[PDB]
Symmetry: C6
Subunit: 162 residues, 6 copies
Amino acid sequence: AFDTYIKLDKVDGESTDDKHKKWIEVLGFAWGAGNECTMESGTQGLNTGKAMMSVLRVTKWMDCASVKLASAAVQGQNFPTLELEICTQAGDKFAFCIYKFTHVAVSSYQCSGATGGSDRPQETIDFAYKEVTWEYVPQDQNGKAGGKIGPEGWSLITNKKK
Amino acid sequence: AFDTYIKLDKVDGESTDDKHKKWIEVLGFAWGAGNECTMESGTQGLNTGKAMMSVLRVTKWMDCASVKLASAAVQGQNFPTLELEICTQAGDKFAFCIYKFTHVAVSSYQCSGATGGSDRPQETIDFAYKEVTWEYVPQDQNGKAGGKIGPEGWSLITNKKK
Amino acid sequence: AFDTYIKLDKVDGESTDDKHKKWIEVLGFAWGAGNECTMESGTQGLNTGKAMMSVLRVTKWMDCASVKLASAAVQGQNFPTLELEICTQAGDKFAFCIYKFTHVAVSSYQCSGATGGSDRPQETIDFAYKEVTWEYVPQDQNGKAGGKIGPEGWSLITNKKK
Amino acid sequence: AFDTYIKLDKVDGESTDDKHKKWIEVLGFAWGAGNECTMESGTQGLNTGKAMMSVLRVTKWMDCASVKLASAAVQGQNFPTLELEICTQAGDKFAFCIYKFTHVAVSSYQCSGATGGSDRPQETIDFAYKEVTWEYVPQDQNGKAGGKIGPEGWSLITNKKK
Amino acid sequence: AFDTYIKLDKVDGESTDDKHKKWIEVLGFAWGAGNECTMESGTQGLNTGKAMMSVLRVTKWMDCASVKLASAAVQGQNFPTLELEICTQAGDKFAFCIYKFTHVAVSSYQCSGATGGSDRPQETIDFAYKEVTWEYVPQDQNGKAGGKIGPEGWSLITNKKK
Amino acid sequence: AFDTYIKLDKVDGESTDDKHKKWIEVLGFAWGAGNECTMESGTQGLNTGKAMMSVLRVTKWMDCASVKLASAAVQGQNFPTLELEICTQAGDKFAFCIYKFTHVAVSSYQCSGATGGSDRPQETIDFAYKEVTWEYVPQDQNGKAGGKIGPEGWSLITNKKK
């Protein structure tokens, strides 16, 4: 259920499934946005102010991407595009949620090792970006998919939509 | 027990039950209000000062509303009306508590994915607003409902009741 | 054991037991007082300074009082009298502790809903006040009650006892 | 094991055991002292500076002392003497630790009620003081007691020993 | 699984396995790097700013290295090289991750003892450094290893790569 | 396993084992040292700066030493020597780690009592000092001991080694 993959330009991960070959296998993502809307209690309009977005926080094991992720950090390396993709365990293994970032960087890379229990050390990566898109897809109780829900998004270079 | 649904103007969720078609299915809500009454210990009257209210914090899975919720955030999108509704599992599936917000915005949208366990990622949404109403309904031990308890509320535009 | 009820002037709760009809059924109360006695280590006398008291923090389910409690908050509504009462499960269901507040307000009302597990949402209410009284009653191991322990208390309008 | 009792001048608690009639039965005490000795790393001598002591934090159920404890708080009531006593479950139910405070006050009284589970609400009391004494007594593996370990202590009025 | 060893110049640990004789056996490592990339939302470029790296936090039992580690701390002792190495439990016990630090110091040494349960006290060591290298190696599902992933790294003396 | 004893000059504890008669039996110790080595990222050398050490935090039950420990606190009492010693459960009950402090004080004494469960109240003592030594001893898998690992240490009066 909710198997998550993520793609970086010229950065081979280790995945194996048909639709995500050499992608990076990821556990959790965590991501957020929201504006500066106060509870005011004195102003007539709402007053949304400015828009804002959060880094994406990826969790995953060590793989073949580690070293590049490690270097990316201290290198301030610019990527054109990061694609996040969560795909259904059942149904048709399709992506019911397709995220898309543009102008991405690794803002932090962390590493740590349980020691003697769970296999594979675990890393946590923070991906800073400029632009992004949501895209969601429902699933027919009959197993199959349904219509895709209008790909929308936002840009921190323009402070406009999509 | 305590099944919670929530409605937004022109924002189809995914619900299915008769009374809440295409509504957004929600787990928890959390909401609060209260004034600035100090323990003083020097003033003769009570001294309630100003009134205040909190954002509503919704919890729910990803659905078809996600993308719109996502966009709403960075878009500062204004909605006329948000209706919250908690409905009894037994009895007559009626709403024993009907909340009503007027002039609503999404102040924050957060996203996160367990990775490989529970199904469906989970989002947490903060809804800023201008006005609102409580409304509660008791339930007859004989299963059925009882009289509705006077719909009351408050406005941050007037700082008056109802 | 330790069943707690609480009464507000013209504010029907939902209780049912003989001695507390239409009272508000409550789970926890939490309450505190104490003065500003420092560990000094330089002054000869003790130096109690000023007296102080805390809000009472009530916990309970949603009931018929909710809406009034909700309104009370933003309304800064003044009540003459709040009576707290904890009554023995065994023995004679009598109140072994009788609290009494005078000039009460709701300083905050909070709401929240588990989602799908425990029944009934849960609210937490903070009651600000001016005056109050303890009153305790022992219980005879023979089941029955014993003498009542001198009703005492204090006032924040006078900073005197009882 | 480690049954704790505590005595206040003209303040009947509820205890029953032979050696502690009408004393107040207590669960935990928590107490501390220590000076202002820094890790310096620049000064030749140690440099203990000033001496200091902590309030005693008592935990216990509601009893017949509650009301007096409650009043003591807001009243800044001065007591001459508080005796703490921890007594062995086995052996001879003797006190292997005898604490003694002089010039005591209640600096805070807190109250709280679980609601519906454990019996008896629980209060936490902070006792401010001027002077105090330790006294400890070993126990013969043969069940019986041993010699008492020199009653020592300290005073915050003199900043001298015993 | 994920057995971790670490080597210091002229500092015999206690390990025993063929490939890591007299090395120091370690449980967890924890390590991190990342730059100062803000979510900006006003600047056109990304703006990675400066690069930065974290201390390495080692966890291990007391061994023969303890005393030297202890002395290193207060001595500010400079080492040329610290090699970290995590080796597969299965396959060929090879190191699928080879870390390499240059110009290392012990910035802190901590000690602590459970008391009576787990064997061996536990120490936590922080290793400050100047330079370092990642190096990772995949593993053939057929048990054996695969190609090594380009040894990269970074230097805080140059603020350049590798 | 890892049985810990500690000795103070003219301060009889309660221990019983042959090698530690009347010593104080202790559960945990916790102790630390380390210098002020920054991650700099601008300076060429390492830059260890100053050396520093932590108090030793002892945990133990109440015994015959309590009262003296209690008095030591408020008395700022100077001891010449504190010896810490952790001894193997198996093998030959020898001390595989011998700590030695010189010019010791009790900087804090804390007390607390579970109430009715675990036997014996528990105290936590902080020992401030001037000087100290590590000393470790390996153990032959054949049960017996091995060579002792050079007794080293440090002084806060000189800021030199051993």
